[PDB]
mmCIF file of C-alpha atoms and ligand atoms in Angstrom:
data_model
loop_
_atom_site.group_PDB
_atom_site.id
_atom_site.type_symbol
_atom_site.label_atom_id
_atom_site.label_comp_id
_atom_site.label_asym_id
_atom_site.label_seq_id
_atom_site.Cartn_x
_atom_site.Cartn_y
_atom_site.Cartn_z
ATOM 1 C CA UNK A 22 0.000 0.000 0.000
ATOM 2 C CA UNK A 23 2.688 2.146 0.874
ATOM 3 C CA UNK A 24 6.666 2.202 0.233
ATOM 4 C CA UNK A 25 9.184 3.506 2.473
ATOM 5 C CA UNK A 26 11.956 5.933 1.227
ATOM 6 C CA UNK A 27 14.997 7.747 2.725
ATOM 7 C CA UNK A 28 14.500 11.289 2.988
ATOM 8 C CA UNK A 29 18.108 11.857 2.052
ATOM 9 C CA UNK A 30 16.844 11.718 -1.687
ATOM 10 C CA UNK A 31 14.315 13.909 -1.533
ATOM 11 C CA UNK A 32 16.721 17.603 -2.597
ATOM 12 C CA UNK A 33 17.187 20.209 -5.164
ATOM 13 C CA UNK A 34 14.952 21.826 -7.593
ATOM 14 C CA UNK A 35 13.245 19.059 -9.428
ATOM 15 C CA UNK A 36 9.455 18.758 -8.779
ATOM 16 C CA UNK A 37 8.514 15.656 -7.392
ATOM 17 C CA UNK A 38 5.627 13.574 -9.231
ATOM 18 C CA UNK A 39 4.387 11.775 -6.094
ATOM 19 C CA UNK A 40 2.935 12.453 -2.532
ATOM 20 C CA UNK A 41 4.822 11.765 0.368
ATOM 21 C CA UNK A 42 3.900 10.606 3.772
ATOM 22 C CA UNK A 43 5.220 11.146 7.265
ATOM 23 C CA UNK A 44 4.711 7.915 9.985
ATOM 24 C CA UNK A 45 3.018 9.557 13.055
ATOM 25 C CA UNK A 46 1.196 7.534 15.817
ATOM 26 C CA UNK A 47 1.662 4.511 12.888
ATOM 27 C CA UNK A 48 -0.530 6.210 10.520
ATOM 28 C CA UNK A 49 0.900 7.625 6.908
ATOM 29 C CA UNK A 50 0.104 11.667 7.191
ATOM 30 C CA UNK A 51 0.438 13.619 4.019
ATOM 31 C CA UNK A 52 3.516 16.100 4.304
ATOM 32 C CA UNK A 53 4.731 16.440 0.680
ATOM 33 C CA UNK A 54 2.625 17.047 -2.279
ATOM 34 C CA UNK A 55 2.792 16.408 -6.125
ATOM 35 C CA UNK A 56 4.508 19.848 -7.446
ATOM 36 C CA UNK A 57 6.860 20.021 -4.373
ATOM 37 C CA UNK A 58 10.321 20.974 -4.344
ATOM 38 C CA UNK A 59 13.237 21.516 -1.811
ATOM 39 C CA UNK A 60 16.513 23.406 -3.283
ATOM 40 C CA UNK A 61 17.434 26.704 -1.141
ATOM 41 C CA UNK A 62 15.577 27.494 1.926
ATOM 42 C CA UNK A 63 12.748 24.668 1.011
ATOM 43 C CA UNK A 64 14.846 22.252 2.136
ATOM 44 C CA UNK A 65 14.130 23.605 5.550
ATOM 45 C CA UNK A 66 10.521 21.130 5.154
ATOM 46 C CA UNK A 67 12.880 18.327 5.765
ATOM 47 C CA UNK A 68 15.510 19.630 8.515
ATOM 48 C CA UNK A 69 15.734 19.250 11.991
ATOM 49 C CA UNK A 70 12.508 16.716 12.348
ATOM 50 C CA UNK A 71 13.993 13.409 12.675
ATOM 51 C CA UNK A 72 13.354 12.748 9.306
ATOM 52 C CA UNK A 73 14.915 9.276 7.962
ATOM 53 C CA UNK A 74 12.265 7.675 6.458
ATOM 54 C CA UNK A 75 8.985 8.390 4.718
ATOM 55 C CA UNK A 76 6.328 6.756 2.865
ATOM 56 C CA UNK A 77 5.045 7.096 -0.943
ATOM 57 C CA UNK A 78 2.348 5.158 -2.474
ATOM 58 C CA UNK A 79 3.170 2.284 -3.682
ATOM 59 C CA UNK A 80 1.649 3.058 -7.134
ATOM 60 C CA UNK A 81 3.704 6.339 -7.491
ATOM 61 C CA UNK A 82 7.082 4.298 -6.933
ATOM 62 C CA UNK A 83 8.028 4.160 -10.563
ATOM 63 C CA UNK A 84 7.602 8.173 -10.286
ATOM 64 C CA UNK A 85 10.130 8.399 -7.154
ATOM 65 C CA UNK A 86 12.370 6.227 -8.954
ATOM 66 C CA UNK A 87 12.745 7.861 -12.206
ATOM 67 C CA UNK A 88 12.612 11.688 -9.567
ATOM 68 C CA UNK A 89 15.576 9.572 -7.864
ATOM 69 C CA UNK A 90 17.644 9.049 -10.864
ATOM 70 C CA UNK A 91 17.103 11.954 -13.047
ATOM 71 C CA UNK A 92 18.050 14.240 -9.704
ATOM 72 C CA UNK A 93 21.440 12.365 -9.611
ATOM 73 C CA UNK A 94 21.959 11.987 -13.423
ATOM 74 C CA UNK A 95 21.404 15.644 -13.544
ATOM 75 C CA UNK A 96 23.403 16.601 -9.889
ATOM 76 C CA UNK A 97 26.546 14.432 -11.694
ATOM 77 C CA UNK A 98 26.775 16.344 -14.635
ATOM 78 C CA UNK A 99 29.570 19.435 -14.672
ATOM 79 C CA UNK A 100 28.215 20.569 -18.009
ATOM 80 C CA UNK A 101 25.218 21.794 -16.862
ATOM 81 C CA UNK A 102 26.225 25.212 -15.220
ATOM 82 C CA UNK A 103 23.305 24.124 -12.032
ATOM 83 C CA UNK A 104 23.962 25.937 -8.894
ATOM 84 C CA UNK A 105 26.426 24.243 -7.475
ATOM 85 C CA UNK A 106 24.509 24.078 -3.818
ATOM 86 C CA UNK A 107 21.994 22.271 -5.589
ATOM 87 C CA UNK A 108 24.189 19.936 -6.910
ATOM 88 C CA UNK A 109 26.039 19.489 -3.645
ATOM 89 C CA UNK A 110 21.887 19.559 -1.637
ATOM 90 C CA UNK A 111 21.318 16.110 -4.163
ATOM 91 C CA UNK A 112 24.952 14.407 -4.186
ATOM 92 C CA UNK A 113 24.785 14.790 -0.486
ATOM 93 C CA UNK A 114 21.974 13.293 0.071
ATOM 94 C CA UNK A 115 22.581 10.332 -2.200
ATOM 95 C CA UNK A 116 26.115 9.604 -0.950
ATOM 96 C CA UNK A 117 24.090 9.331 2.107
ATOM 97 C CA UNK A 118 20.939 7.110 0.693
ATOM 98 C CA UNK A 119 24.006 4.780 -0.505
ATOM 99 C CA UNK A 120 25.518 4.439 2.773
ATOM 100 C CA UNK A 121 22.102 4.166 4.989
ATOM 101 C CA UNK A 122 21.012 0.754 2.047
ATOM 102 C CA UNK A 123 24.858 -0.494 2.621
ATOM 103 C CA UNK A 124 24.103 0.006 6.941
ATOM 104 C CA UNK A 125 20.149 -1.636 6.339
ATOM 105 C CA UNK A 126 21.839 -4.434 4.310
ATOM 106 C CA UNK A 127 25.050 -4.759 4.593
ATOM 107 C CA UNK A 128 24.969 -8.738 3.281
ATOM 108 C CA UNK A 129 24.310 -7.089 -0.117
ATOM 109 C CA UNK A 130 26.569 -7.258 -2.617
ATOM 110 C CA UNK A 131 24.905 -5.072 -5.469
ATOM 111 C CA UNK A 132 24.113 -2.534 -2.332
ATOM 112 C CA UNK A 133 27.853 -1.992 -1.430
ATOM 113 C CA UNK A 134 29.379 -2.267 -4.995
ATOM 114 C CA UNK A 135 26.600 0.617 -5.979
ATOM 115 C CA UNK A 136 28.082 2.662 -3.195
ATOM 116 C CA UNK A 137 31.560 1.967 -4.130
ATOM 117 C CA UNK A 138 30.894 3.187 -7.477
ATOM 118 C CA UNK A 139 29.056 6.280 -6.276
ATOM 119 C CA UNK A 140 31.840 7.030 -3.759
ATOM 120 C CA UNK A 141 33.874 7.323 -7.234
ATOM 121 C CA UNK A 142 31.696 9.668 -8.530
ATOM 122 C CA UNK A 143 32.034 11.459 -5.220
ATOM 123 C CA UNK A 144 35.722 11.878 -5.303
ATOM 124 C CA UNK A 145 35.375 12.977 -8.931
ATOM 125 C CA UNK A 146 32.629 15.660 -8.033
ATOM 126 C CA UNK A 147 35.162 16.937 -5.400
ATOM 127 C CA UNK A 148 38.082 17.172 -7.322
ATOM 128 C CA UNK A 149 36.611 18.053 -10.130
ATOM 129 C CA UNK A 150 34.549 21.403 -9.072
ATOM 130 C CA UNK A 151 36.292 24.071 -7.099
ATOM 131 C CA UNK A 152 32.943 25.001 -5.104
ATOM 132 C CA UNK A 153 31.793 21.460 -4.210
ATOM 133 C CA UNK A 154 33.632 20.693 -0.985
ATOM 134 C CA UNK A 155 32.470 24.091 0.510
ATOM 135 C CA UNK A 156 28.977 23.678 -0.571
ATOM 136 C CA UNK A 157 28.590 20.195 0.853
ATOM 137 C CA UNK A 158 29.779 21.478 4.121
ATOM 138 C CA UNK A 159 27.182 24.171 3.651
ATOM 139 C CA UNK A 160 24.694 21.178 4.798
ATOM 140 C CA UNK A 161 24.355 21.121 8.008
ATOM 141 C CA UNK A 162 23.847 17.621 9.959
ATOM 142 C CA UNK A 163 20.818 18.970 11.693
ATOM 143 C CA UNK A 164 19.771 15.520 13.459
ATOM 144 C CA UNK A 165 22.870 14.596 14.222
ATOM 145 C CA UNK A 166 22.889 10.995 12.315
ATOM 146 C CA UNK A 167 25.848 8.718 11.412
ATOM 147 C CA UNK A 168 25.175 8.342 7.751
ATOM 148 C CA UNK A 169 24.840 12.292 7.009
ATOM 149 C CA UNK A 170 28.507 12.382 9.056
ATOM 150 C CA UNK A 171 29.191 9.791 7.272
ATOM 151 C CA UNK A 172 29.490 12.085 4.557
ATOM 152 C CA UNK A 173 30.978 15.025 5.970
ATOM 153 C CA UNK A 174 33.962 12.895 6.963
ATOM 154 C CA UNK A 175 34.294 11.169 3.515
ATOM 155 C CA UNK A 176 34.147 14.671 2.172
ATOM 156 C CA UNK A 177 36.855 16.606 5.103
ATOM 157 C CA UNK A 178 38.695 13.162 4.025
ATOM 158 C CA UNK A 179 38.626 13.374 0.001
ATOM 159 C CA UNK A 180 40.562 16.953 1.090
ATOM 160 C CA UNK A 181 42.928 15.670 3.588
ATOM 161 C CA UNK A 182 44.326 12.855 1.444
ATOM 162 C CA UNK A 183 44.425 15.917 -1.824
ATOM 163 C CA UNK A 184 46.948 17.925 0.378
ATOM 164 C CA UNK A 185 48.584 14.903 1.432
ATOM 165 C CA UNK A 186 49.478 14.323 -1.796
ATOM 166 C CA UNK A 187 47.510 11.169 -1.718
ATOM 167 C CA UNK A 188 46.788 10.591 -6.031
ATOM 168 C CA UNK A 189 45.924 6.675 -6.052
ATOM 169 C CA UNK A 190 42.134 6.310 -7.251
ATOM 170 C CA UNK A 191 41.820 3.366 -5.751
ATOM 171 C CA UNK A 192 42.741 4.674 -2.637
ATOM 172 C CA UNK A 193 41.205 7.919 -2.499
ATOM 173 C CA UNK A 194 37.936 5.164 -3.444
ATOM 174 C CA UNK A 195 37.999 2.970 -0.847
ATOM 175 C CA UNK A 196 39.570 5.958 1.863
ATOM 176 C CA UNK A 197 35.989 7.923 0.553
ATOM 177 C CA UNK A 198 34.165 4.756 0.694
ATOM 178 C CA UNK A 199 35.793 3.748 4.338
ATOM 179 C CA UNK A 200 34.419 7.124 5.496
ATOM 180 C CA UNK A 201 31.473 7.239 4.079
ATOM 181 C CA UNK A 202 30.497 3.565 6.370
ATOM 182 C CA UNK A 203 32.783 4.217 9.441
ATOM 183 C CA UNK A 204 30.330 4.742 11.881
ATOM 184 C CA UNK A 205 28.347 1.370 10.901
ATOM 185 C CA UNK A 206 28.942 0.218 14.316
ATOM 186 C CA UNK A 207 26.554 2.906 15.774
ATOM 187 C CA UNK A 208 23.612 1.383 13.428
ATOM 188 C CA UNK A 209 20.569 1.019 16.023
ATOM 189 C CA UNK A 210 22.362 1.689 18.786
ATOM 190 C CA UNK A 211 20.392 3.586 21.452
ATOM 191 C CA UNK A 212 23.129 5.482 22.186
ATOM 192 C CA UNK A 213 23.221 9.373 21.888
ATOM 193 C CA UNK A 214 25.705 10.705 19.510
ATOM 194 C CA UNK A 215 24.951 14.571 20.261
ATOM 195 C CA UNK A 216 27.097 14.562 23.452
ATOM 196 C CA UNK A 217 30.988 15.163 24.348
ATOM 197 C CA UNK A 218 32.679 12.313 24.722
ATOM 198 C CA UNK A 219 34.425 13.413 27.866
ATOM 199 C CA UNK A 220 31.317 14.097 29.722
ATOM 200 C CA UNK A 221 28.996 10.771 28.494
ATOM 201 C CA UNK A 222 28.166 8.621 31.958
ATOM 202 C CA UNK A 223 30.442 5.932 32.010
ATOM 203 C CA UNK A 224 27.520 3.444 30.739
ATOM 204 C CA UNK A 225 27.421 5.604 27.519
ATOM 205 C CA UNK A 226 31.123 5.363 26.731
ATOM 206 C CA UNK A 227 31.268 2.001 27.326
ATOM 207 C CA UNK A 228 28.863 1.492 24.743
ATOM 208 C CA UNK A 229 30.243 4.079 22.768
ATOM 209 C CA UNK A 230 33.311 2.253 22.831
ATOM 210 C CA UNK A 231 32.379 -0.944 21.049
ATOM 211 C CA UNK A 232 31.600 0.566 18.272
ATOM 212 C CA UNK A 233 34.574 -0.129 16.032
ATOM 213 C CA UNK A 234 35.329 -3.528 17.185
ATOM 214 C CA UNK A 235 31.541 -4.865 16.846
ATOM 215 C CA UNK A 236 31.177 -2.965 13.421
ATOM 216 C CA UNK A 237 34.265 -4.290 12.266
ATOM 217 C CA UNK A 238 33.774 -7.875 13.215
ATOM 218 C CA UNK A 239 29.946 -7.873 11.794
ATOM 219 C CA UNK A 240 31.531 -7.121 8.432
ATOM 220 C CA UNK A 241 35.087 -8.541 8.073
ATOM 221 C CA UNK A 242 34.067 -12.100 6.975
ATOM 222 C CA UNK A 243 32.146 -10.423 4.450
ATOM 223 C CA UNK A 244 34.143 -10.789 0.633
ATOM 224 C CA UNK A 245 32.462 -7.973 -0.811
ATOM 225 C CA UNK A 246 33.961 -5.413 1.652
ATOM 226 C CA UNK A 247 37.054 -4.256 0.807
ATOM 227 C CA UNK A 248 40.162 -4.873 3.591
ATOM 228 C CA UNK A 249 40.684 -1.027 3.333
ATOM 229 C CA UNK A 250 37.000 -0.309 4.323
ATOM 230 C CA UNK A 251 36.973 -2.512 6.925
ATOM 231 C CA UNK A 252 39.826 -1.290 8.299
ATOM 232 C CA UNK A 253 38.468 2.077 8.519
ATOM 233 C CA UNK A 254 35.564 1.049 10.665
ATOM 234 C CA UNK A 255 37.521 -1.035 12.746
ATOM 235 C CA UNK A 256 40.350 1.362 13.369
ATOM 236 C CA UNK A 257 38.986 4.972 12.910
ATOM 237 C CA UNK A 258 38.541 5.354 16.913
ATOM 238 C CA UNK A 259 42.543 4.751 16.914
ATOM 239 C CA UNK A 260 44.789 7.386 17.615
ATOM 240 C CA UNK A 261 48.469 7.641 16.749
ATOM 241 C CA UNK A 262 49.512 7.333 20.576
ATOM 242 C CA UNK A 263 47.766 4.509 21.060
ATOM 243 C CA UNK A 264 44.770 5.629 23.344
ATOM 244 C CA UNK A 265 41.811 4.238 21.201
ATOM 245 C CA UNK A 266 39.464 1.405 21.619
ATOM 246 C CA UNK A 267 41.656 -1.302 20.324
ATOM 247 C CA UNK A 268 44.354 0.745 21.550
ATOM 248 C CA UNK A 269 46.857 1.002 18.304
ATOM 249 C CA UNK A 270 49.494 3.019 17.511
ATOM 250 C CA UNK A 271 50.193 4.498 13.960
ATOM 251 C CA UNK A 272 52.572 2.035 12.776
ATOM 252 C CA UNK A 273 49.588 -1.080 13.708
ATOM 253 C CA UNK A 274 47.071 1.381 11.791
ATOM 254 C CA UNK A 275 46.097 1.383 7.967
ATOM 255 C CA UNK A 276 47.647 4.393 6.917
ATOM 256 C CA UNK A 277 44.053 5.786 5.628
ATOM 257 C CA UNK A 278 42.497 4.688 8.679
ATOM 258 C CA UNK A 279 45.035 7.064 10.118
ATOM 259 C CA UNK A 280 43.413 9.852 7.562
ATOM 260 C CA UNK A 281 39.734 8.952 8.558
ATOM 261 C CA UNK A 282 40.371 8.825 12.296
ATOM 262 C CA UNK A 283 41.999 12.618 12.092
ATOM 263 C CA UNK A 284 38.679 14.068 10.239
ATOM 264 C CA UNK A 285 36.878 12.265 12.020
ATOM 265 C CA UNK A 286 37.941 13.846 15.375
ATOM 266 C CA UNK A 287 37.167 17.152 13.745
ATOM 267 C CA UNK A 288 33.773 16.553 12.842
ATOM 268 C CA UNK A 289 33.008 14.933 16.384
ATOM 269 C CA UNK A 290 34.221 18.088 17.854
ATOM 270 C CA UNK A 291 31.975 20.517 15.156
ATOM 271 C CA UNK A 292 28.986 18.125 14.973
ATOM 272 C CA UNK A 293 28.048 16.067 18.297
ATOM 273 C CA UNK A 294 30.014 18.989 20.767
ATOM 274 C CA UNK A 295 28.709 21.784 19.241
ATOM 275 C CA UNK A 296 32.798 23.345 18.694
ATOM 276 C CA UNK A 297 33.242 25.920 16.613
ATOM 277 C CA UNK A 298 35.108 25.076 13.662
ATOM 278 C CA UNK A 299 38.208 27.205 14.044
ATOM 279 C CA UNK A 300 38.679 26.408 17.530
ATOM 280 C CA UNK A 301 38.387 22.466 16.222
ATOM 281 C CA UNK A 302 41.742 22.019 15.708
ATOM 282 C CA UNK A 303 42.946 23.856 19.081
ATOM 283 C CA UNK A 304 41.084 21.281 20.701
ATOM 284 C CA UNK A 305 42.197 18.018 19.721
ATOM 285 C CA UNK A 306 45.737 19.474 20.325
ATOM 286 C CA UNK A 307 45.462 20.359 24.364
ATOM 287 C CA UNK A 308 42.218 18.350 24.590
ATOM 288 C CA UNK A 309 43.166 15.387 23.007
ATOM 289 C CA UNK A 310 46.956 15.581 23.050
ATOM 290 C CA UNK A 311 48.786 13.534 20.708
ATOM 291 C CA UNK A 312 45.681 11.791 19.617
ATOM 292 C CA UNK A 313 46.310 12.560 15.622
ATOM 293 C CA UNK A 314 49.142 13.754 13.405
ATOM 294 C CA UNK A 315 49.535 17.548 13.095
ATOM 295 C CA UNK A 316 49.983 17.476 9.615
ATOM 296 C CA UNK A 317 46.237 15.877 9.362
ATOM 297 C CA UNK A 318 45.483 18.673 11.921
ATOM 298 C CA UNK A 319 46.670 21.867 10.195
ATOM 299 C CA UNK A 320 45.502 20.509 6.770
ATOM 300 C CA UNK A 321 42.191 19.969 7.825
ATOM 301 C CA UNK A 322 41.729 23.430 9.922
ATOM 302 C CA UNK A 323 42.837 24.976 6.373
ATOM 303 C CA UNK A 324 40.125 23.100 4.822
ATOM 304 C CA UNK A 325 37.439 24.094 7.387
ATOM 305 C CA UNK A 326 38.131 28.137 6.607
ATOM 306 C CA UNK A 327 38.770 27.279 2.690
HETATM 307 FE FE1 FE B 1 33.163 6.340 15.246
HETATM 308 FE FE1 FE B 2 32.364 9.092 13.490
#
């Protein structure tokens, strides 16, 4: 009767040619109407609700589908001339769609290999548009979820690994990819991401602190996962000096785990503790002392002010 989406893909300028529904007290309540759009300030509709999934009819699905793949057909395209924020509103959002299918089924080959090839495209949209890593970060993670930062930290990473001098597709790839699924431990987990670390009740970091190792081990087994990515998962709560979860130090670490761990940090600090980005860096120095390499550090403050 219904169909559930992810709100991630609903962005940008295109009309949509279906209704769609918001779940409350289990019944499907009109929100979004035929003619709708969301680029610029419209896109406020869908922030700071809790919005993750939705519902359409299920006899407008081959509608959403064809919205779903003309938006990112279109969003892909650098010939176009498109405001670049819209672009970034819709790649966003899909990077995201890719990684919440690859968290919802992770024993899914086509799922992951999609992502992977989208996380291409992602790298390529970066490097490829001068604009595209400030307008992404121009979308703010309003509800605080793991597959919007997710994003952020593929994107802060794509940068970090540029001024690293980091060239390899494959490994900018699977580093963007790696990123993109590094917080699949926290999948329904009740815990509350929006919180400083150094203040959670010691129940809450203990359950924070699984997170790597049970992500990691749900995965690793798995042939379609690349070693790189789940290295990342499994390691991105490292730090050089050895005061992580699994408690490694740089030379046990996968070198782009390394990479991912560092933006990571940052978007912790800007994201779930409410720091503001220049004083980011400042922090993990005297707050977290030793925690990441200073290179990753400076490059990644220079990338937060442009
Ligand atoms: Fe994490
Ligand atoms: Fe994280």
């Amino acid at each position: 009767d219904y169909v559930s989406i992810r709100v991630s893909t609903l962005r940008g300028d295109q009309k949509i040619d279906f209704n769609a529904y918001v779940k409350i007290n289990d019944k499907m309540i009109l929100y979004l109407r035929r003619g709708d759009s969301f680029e610029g300030e419209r896109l406020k509709r869908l922030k700071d609700k809790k919005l993750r999934k939705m519902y359409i009819l299920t006899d407008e699905e081959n509608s959403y589908r064809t919205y779903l793949q003309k938006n990112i057909e279109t969003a892909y395209d650098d010939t176009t001339g498109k405001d670049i924020q819209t672009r970034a509103d819709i790649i966003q959002g899909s990077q995201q769609n890719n990684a919440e299918e690859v968290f919802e089924n992770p024993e899914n080959v086509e799922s992951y290999n999609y992502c992977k090839d989208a996380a291409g495209k992602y790298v390529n949209f970066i490097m490829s548009n001068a604009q595209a890593l400030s307008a992404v970060m121009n979308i703010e993670n309003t509800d605080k979820t793991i597959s919007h930062h997710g994003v952020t930290v593929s994107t802060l990473s794509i940068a970090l690994a540029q001024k690293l001098g980091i060239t390899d597709p494959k490994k900018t790839q699977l580093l963007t990819l790696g990123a993109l699924l590094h917080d699949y431990g926290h999948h329904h987990s009740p815990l509350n991401l929006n919180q400083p670390l150094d203040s959670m009740s010691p129940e809450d970091l203990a359950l924070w602190k699984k997170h790597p190792i049970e992500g990691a081990q749900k995965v690793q087994d798995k042939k379609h996962f690349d070693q790189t990515v789940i290295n990342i998962i499994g390691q991105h709560e490292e730090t050089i000096n050895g005061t992580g979860p699994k408690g490694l130090r740089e030379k046990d670490m996968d070198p782009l785990a390394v990479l991912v761990s560092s933006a990571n940090a940052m978007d912790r600090l800007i994201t779930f503790e409410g720091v503001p980005k220049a004083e980011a860096a400042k922090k993990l120095m005297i707050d977290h002392v030793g925690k990441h390499p200073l290179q990753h550090i400076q490059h990644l403050n220079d990338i937060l002010k442009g």
